[PDB]
Amino acid sequence: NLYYEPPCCTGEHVQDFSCGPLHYKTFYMDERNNALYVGAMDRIFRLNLRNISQSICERDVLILEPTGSDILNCVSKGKREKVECRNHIRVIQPMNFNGQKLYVCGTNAHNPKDYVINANLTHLPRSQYVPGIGLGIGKCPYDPADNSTAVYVENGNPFGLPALYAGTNAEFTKADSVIFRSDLYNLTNGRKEANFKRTVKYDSKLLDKPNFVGSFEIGEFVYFFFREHAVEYINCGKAVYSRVARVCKNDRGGKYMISQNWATYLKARMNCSISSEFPFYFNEIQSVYKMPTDDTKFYATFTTNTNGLIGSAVCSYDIRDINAAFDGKFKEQATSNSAWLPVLNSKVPEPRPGTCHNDTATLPDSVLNFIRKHPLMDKAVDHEFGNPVFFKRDVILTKLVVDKIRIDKLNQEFLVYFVATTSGHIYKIVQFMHYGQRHSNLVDIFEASPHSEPIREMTLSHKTGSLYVATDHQVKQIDIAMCARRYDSCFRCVSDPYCGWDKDVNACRPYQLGLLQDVANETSGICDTSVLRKKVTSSYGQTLHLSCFVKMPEVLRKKQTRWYHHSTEKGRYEVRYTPTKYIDTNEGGLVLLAVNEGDGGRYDSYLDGTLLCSYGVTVDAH
Amino acid sequence: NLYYEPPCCTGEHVQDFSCGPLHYKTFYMDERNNALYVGAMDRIFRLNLRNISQSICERDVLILEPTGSDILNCVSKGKREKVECRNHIRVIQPMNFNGQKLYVCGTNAHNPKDYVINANLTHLPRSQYVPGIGLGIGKCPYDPADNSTAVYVENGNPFGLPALYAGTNAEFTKADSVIFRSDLYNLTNGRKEANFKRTVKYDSKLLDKPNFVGSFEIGEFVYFFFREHAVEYINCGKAVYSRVARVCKNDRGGKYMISQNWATYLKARMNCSISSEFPFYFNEIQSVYKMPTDDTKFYATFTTNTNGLIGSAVCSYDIRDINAAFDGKFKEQATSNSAWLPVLNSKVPEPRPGTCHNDTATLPDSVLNFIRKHPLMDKAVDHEFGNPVFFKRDVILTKLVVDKIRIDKLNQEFLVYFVATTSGHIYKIVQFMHYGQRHSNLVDIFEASPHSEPIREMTLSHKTGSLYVATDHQVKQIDIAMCARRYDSCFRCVSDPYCGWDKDVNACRPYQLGLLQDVANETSGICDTSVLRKKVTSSYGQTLHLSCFVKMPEVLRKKQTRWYHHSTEKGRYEVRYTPTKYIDTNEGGLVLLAVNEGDGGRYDSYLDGTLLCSYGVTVD
Ligand SMILES: *[C@@H]1O[C@H](CO)[C@@H](O[C@@H]2O[C@H](CO)[C@@H](O[C@@H]3O[C@H](CO[C@H]4O[C@H](CO[C@H]5O[C@H](CO)[C@@H](O)[C@H](O)[C@@H]5O[C@H]5O[C@H](CO)[C@@H](O)[C@H](O)[C@@H]5O)[C@@H](O)[C@H](O[C@H]5O[C@H](CO)[C@@H](O)[C@H](O)[C@@H]5O)[C@@H]4O)[C@@H](O)[C@H](O[C@H]4O[C@H](CO)[C@@H](O)[C@H](O)[C@@H]4O[C@H]4O[C@H](CO)[C@@H](O)[C@H](O)[C@@H]4O)[C@@H]3O)[C@H](O)[C@H]2NC(C)=O)[C@H](O)[C@H]1NC(C)=O
Ligand SMILES: *[C@@H]1O[C@H](CO)[C@@H](O[C@@H]2O[C@H](CO)[C@@H](O[C@H]3O[C@H](CO[C@H]4O[C@H](CO[C@H]5O[C@H](CO)[C@@H](O)[C@H](O)[C@@H]5O[C@H]5O[C@H](CO)[C@@H](O)[C@H](O)[C@@H]5O)[C@@H](O)[C@H](O[C@H]5O[C@H](CO)[C@@H](O)[C@H](O)[C@@H]5O)[C@@H]4O)[C@@H](O)[C@H](O[C@H]4O[C@H](CO)[C@@H](O)[C@H](O)[C@@H]4O)[C@@H]3O)[C@H](O)[C@H]2NC(C)=O)[C@H](O)[C@H]1NC(C)=O
Ligand SMILES: *[C@@H]1O[C@H](CO)[C@@H](O[C@@H]2O[C@H](CO)[C@@H](O[C@@H]3O[C@H](CO[C@H]4O[C@H](CO)[C@@H](O)[C@H](O)[C@@H]4O)[C@@H](O)[C@H](O[C@H]4O[C@H](CO)[C@@H](O)[C@H](O)[C@@H]4O[C@H]4O[C@H](CO)[C@@H](O)[C@H](O)[C@@H]4O)[C@@H]3O)[C@H](O)[C@H]2NC(C)=O)[C@H](O)[C@H]1NC(C)=O
Ligand SMILES: *[C@@H]1O[C@H](CO)[C@@H](O[C@@H]2O[C@H](CO)[C@@H](O[C@@H]3O[C@H](CO[C@H]4O[C@H](CO)[C@@H](O)[C@H](O[C@H]5O[C@H](CO)[C@@H](O)[C@H](O)[C@@H]5O)[C@@H]4O)[C@@H](O)[C@H](O)[C@@H]3O)[C@H](O)[C@H]2NC(C)=O)[C@H](O)[C@H]1NC(C)=O
Ligand SMILES: *[C@@H]1O[C@H](CO)[C@@H](O[C@@H]2O[C@H](CO)[C@@H](O[C@@H]3O[C@H](CO[C@H]4O[C@H](CO)[C@@H](O)[C@H](O)[C@@H]4O)[C@@H](O)[C@H](O)[C@@H]3O)[C@H](O)[C@H]2NC(C)=O)[C@H](O)[C@H]1NC(C)=O
Ligand SMILES: *[C@@H]1O[C@H](CO)[C@@H](O[C@@H]2O[C@H](CO)[C@@H](O[C@@H]3O[C@H](CO[C@H]4O[C@H](CO)[C@@H](O)[C@H](O)[C@@H]4O)[C@@H](O)[C@H](O)[C@@H]3O)[C@H](O)[C@H]2NC(C)=O)[C@H](O)[C@H]1NC(C)=O
Ligand SMILES: *[C@@H]1O[C@H](CO)[C@@H](O[C@@H]2O[C@H](CO)[C@@H](O[C@H]3O[C@H](CO[C@H]4O[C@H](CO)[C@@H](O)[C@H](O)[C@@H]4O)[C@@H](O)[C@H](O)[C@@H]3O)[C@H](O)[C@H]2NC(C)=O)[C@H](O)[C@H]1NC(C)=O
Ligand SMILES: *[C@@H]1O[C@H](CO)[C@@H](O[C@@H]2O[C@H](CO)[C@@H](O[C@@H]3O[C@H](CO)[C@@H](O)[C@H](O)[C@@H]3O)[C@H](O)[C@H]2NC(C)=O)[C@H](O)[C@H]1NC(C)=O
Ligand SMILES: *[C@@H]1O[C@H](CO)[C@@H](O[C@@H]2O[C@H](CO)[C@@H](O)[C@H](O)[C@H]2NC(C)=O)[C@H](O)[C@H]1NC(C)=O
Ligand SMILES: *[C@@H]1O[C@H](CO)[C@@H](O[C@@H]2O[C@H](CO)[C@@H](O)[C@H](O)[C@H]2NC(C)=O)[C@H](O)[C@H]1NC(C)=O
Ligand SMILES: *[C@@H]1O[C@H](CO)[C@@H](O[C@@H]2O[C@H](CO)[C@@H](O)[C@H](O)[C@H]2NC(C)=O)[C@H](O)[C@H]1NC(C)=O
Ligand SMILES: *[C@@H]1O[C@H](CO)[C@@H](O)[C@H](O)[C@H]1NC(C)=O
Ligand SMILES: *[C@@H]1O[C@H](CO)[C@@H](O)[C@H](O)[C@H]1NC(C)=O
């Protein structure tokens, strides 16, 4: 009766875009030009970032479908031509080539093909040839189901030349998982200046059935995030571990026989666990996110193995801890029958393997010999505070974006995580500090996609204050703050860091100084004077139904509702549920069966000890 | 008016015995003599097995408290005098010595002491001395919080002599975990005939912080069940594994320098996992149970590590799978920096290590050298069907007992597991077979102890049809079949293997041929003619509350309540839950607000697609 929250967000603060079941995947956001590029099957879209509903299917698209030759070879004798032999876009990157243009790569019917196109989704002139395009190693997956990553890097490579860094698995029939860098071309004079870079082929010490979840350029390096079969666990069982790997941007490879291989490739296990004498590990990373303005923090989701009892967690990682693992001890298995042990630093050659050098071919061979035999660091990368930001049983958390909020006049700084689930929901998790410790609270759960439709991509725009979600059927823009629309109660309003309750107008608003807010729940009872007792009348003998929410908000549905009654000649007491007098509803409601005289009076409803709503009941003689 | 199940069982089918916070622990059940012996702090009781409330505190007890010097020395070491420095009974075993006597061992103020007493809880005459009795060191723990085990064996030991086998800690401050056999005495002539047997002292390959949960004499062996730090896991992290260890009762030890050590000690990991490409392990065994008349099956509880996300499982084991591990390949860590690998059979000496022999000192030294370096088998003992009988998230399962109901027709059988939790509850799980596949069903949950009072011991008397639970505050006898008391509905009655529904009396009775029963849920409409049916009226469109149970039984809250509405103008349709019209009640009810003309009709309540109760709604 009192509180009603409109469902969200699959019913304005929500904008949809769809041209059919085109398997939308791969985001590239250009805030300065109000553009959200979205890849799809045989297509790339340029959506209006401010309001993706204002984009038109026929206008804001560029068709990139395979040739009849590539479709023929892909079908062969037997293969699905319906989606598997289409051109699934997997890479969309900003690329400098006589101005700001887009580098695009697609699966192209199991024949990865890359392109360079204008920002307005037009081809370059037919006479315009871009050096390196269509040549070399496949730059994106052969398979639409492959989990790959890529990042186009303008600065820091050998000779100041641009290059694409990428991790991919190519065909699943063959076993060629690789982290590679494209050939270094001078795009002006067309000369190939340096050969490509790649992990040693078929070396399971470098990659063992990886699934890539992200890649970033930071400082003088490029970092890759993936999960893989844990080689160092084989003597104890089968496990999938999470990895961050690192290469120097200026890596040129070693001497003649190994010049095509990385000379600086290292990787480390990522630690996401609940701390104790027996740490509980979430071993399988699902996605990683970096704030565009912060190159020092990485936020990632991890799950247990999805067989058996399931749990998910969110952990955060500081670049100094990542690099600490790469500056620390190496791991080593001396023989195939040996334990995995740390290497004495006195055994490490000089210069230290993994450090950057302008001329890696000049490094002593002992350095290259060592790094090719010790790609794995001994240290597992420390997660901040040694515990998950957030963890949850029986949920698979996948994509995530992270926002930042500062209230400098009250000295409160919050992170807000938006984390997708395999069921199509978004978790709204706020992080805050209290007495030197980090805490989190699940602020909200809303629906972004039906259960049968997985969330394939998620990104975030600080400029538009919107979250973008891609599924197989549409793209969905969701405002990260819906204070006025979503929260009609002080109770819900003050828990959201974007919001604040205005007791004057009795409504939830975007936060500003002077509004009620308690993200950390450190002033419980702040909403007491904002609970407006609703007076109601009822005749003698008829059934009355008291309820705060029409439907209890999802994040609150598993908390305790306790009702109290205060009438004349009766002290205030808790309402015990009897079969034919007091009934509870799964929404925290109170039903009065056979109302008599003494049933009238004050009724208070508390949720985990905090006052939720109040009623004034009057009963006549009928 | 509604189905009502009264609470159970903390309040004629439940009997209590208590003489104070005496820390009741250690059961020994003598069904032939209607006795349940219970150890306690400084006390041992003999309870009437048929009805433990008949027992009298002052009459059915023998005080066994430490000497004043024992208590003095116990607090000299820095222990707490109130509880730690008392004599906690930890072993009660039947023992032949001029008749049927009892072997008793207690912690005795961190100075383990053992005794031999009569079955009626009286001391033997002081003139009568029992050879070997006196010091309990190696026989029961120093610490009341220790998890130890022991079994007294009359037959199969060297020279036909009796012996106590035990796993415990041999030192109160220093760590000396040991699996141990007492000195072989001839109790008639009083001579010490053979020395004790023990695992090599301080050898982490044999025991590494073990917590023992049971021990049994089976065939020519004694088996020990325990969990311990997983030594073969150290290169990958920290873990606790579950083990079964085995010694030959034959065992006399090797030659002169190692004569005191087992020559036949082997152990193997125990596998309790959900089967898949990535098995999910429950690694920490909590208790093990064997049926008195069956030496081929063992039933155990396993938990994940209690830090982090928690689950518990019940797995069963066949003796042949246990011995298959001991007959299989050995595990080996060649050097301290080596992987753990299986040993080529051609490298194993003869006679095969771990096999029994009348004269183990005669075994070639190479056999003894091998078995002392390779105590751990490569194979992990297969659990039956490769999956838990039953597993549950968010609960810690501890003690368990298992009953067998024999069906005459077609040689079938039900197993009923009674499994305690740390919260004081007993899970009642029936296991049944169908097309050669194993199934289980959680039939009931009831309360045997308050949450803050953990369950310390649990046993089962098939003769009396009762289980017995020991807590710090009391002993509780609970009938395993409470058909008439617990179930007042056909729905609940037919699912319990002990019970059957009688339509003539409209009640639940102990099962006999003719009553309705559907443990396997193969005739879902069996209770349709016996469901709760009633008619209700709603005036002026007031809010109406339909319901079947007073309180939904705990095991039924997991299923989905669905209401169907039959009208002459709307047909039979499932009532869609809409916030402005239809609300759910935590006890399976249906709340119709703003009743109208079209709301009238028949309302059937189904629990997971089985009819629970039906309504006839008319509106005026
Ligand atoms: C992710 O982040 C988590 C949170 O930050 C982090 O949690 C911390 O986890 C640990 C568990 O990993 C918690 O517990 C501690 O565990 C320590 C390690 O103990 C075990 O490991 C020993 C070493 O074995 C490795 O190293 C050998 C030599 O290289 C190899 O031969 C082995 O094969 C093994 O190698 C593996 O691990 C190496 C290091 O990771 C790695 O290089 C290698 O490649 C391979 O992967 C074992 O010797 C030890 O076994 C001994 O002890 C057990 C009893 O537990 C016996 O059963 C065994 O038979 C054996 O004798 C373990 O298997 C412990 O040392 C540590 O103990 C100290 O602290 C506790 C209190 O915290 C004291 O009670 C205890 O007495 C110890 O105190 C003393 O010593 C230490 C140093 O020795 C000293 O600092 C201290 O002041 C005191 O003097 C403790 O139990 C820990 O609590 C967690 N922290 C928090 C804050 O929660 C997690 O590890 C991270 N994960 C990863 C992967 O990094
Ligand atoms: C409890 O009961 C459960 C239910 O009954 C059991 O479940 C079964 O679990 C297994 C997994 O454990 C599932 O199988 C899939 O795994 C197996 C095993 O493969 C892994 O192990 C291989 C061998 O590693 C070990 O032996 C080496 C040789 O001795 C050692 O050098 C090494 O250090 C390992 O040692 C440990 O294990 C052994 C044996 O247990 C032990 O003696 C040691 O002391 C030590 O503890 C590895 O080679 C594999 O690695 C592979 O993957 C790497 C990438 O990560 C590659 O780099 C590498 O080259 C290799 O490819 C794995 O780590 C597979 O054999 C099995 O194969 C499928 O496919 C083959 C194809 O031919 C087929 O023949 C198989 O039948 C199977 O279909 C699977 O991949 C089972 O599915 C599962 N069973 C059921 C019914 O669900 C559980 O095992 C049991 N637990 C215990 C502890 O007993
Ligand atoms: C990818 O590949 C492209 C294409 O090759 C490359 O771009 C080229 O870089 C070179 C090197 O910087 C450029 O060459 C220089 O260009 C400047 C500017 O020239 C134009 O503008 C002037 C007006 O100021 C006109 O007069 C001229 O005709 C051009 O239109 C010149 O000033 C440079 O001249 C010096 O060096 C020449 C030899 O290299 C001499 O012949 C000449 O006399 C000049 O010498 C004087 O200056 C030197 C220092 O600059 C000094 O060392 C001498 O002693 C002497 O004092 C030179 O021609 C070229 O224009 C670029 N081309 C394009 C299309 O941009 C990219 O650099 C490459 N990418 C990467 C990452 O390497
Ligand atoms: C790239 O990375 C992604 C993400 O990490 C990988 O995606 C996993 O991919 C596999 C294979 O495609 C998926 O597994 C499938 O899931 C299907 C949907 O199953 C759910 O829904 C069913 C109802 O329709 C339900 O029955 C099913 O239950 C089963 O799984 C439960 C645990 O997941 C288990 O408890 C149940 O008992 C039961 O076994 C699921 O709830 C299913 O129909 C398929 O048979 C198959 O299982 C995973 O869902 C993907 N995971 C995620 C997080 O998206 C992808 O494989 C990677 N690519 C490569 C090449 O490796
Ligand atoms: C802000 O913080 C306040 C505390 O700092 C919150 O108030 C408290 O909230 C808790 C619940 O989180 C209430 O909890 C109690 O829980 C115990 C134990 O609970 C368990 O056992 C029962 C019985 O089996 C089981 O049913 C439950 O599910 C639990 O597993 C109960 O015994 C108590 O009766 C009570 O329910 C506190 O009562 C409550 N008040 C105080 C003063 O602690 C407050 O809700 C927070 N506000 C927010 C988050 O908006
Ligand atoms: C022998 O085996 C036993 C069973 O496996 C082992 O038992 C474990 O013993 C430890 C320590 O004695 C217990 O840990 C403690 O739990 C208590 C009480 O916990 C409960 O109450 C608190 C509130 O007071 C609540 O927060 C918890 O959630 C519990 O509800 C704590 O107060 C202690 O600080 C400590 O954490 C284990 O709980 C217990 N586990 C089980 C399954 O019984 C025993 O340790 C073994 N003996 C030896 C010598 O190792
Ligand atoms: C623990 O110690 C107990 C006390 O000694 C053992 O019990 C004793 O067992 C012996 C059996 O050897 C038993 O003796 C029997 O034989 C005696 C002599 O008999 C022989 O002599 C006749 C004629 O002299 C000859 O023809 C036969 O071939 C044979 O060689 C008899 O005098 C005696 O009455 C009896 O028949 C002892 O009586 C018995 N002692 C007691 C107190 O029971 C016990 O065996 C041992 N436990 C184990 C497991 O070894
Ligand atoms: C005895 O066995 C029958 C046959 O399985 C049980 O009926 C079935 O119960 C399951 C749930 O255990 C029902 O499944 C569910 O369907 C809903 C709606 O589609 C879905 O949301 C759930 O995820 C689940 O899949 C199933 O519909 C139902 N079958 C029929 C015909 O009603 C019955 O509950 C068992 N009875 C007892 C007392 O165990
Ligand atoms: C985002 O764009 C869509 C489409 O242009 C807007 O939807 C329209 O809303 C106006 C006024 O509310 C109507 O007159 C149109 O008929 C709507 N068009 C469609 C296709 O529904 C939407 O309002 C825009 N949202 C924002 C926040 O500007
Ligand atoms: C088990 O023994 C208890 C204790 O003797 C019985 O409880 C008593 O029942 C008798 C009647 O048989 C009453 O006279 C006593 O007042 C009861 N005492 C208590 C403390 O309850 C109990 O009835 C016996 N149960 C069975 C099944 O024999
Ligand atoms: C407890 O049991 C012992 C052992 O049977 C009893 O002691 C016997 O008492 C009878 C007399 O009734 C004597 O003839 C035996 O010689 C005794 N045997 C021993 C080994 O002492 C004792 O009387 C019993 N006590 C009670 C109270 O029943
Ligand atoms: C390495 O290259 C950078 C950039 O070209 C340059 O500034 C630096 O001086 C070089 N250092 C050496 C030692 O060659
Ligand atoms: C071992 O002793 C038992 C009984 O003591 C006997 O039956 C068996 O034959 C003996 N075996 C050998 C090899 O002496």
Numbering used by the authors:
A (entry chain A): 40 to 50, 62 to 672
B (entry chain B): 40 to 50, 62 to 670
Article excerpt on this structure:
The semaphorins are the largest family of evolutionarily conserved axon guidance cues. The semaphorins signal through their main receptors, plexins, which are single-spanning transmembrane proteins expressed in a variety of cell types, including neurons, cancer cells or endothelial cells. We determined crystal structures of Drosophila Sema1a1–2, Sema1b1–2, Sema2a1–3 and Sema2b1–3 to a 3.6-, 2.8-, 2.1- and 2.5 -Å resolution, respectively. All structures contain the sema domain composed of a seven-bladed β-propeller fold, which is followed by a PSI domain.
The secreted semaphorins Sema2a and Sema2b also contain an Ig-like domain positioned C-terminally to their PSI domains. Sema2a and Sema2b are very similar and share over 67% sequence identity. A superposition of Sema2a1–3 and Sema2b1–3 crystal structures unveiled that Sema2a and Sema2b are also highly similar in structure with an rmsd of 1.1 Å over 608 Cα atoms (for Sema2a chain A and Sema2b chain A). Most notable variations are observed in the distribution of charged patches located on their surfaces. On the other hand, when we mutated the equivalent cysteine residue to serine in Sema2afull and Sema2bfull, both proteins partially maintained the homodimeric architecture and a mixture of a monomer and a non-covalent dimer was observed. However, this distinctive glycan is also well-ordered in the Sema1b and Sema2b structures. Within classes, Sema2b binds PlexB ~8 times more strongly than Sema2a. Given the essentially identical architecture of Sema2a and Sema2b, we conclude that their different binding properties either in strength or lifetime of binding to PlexB or interaction with additional co-receptor, determine their distinct functions.
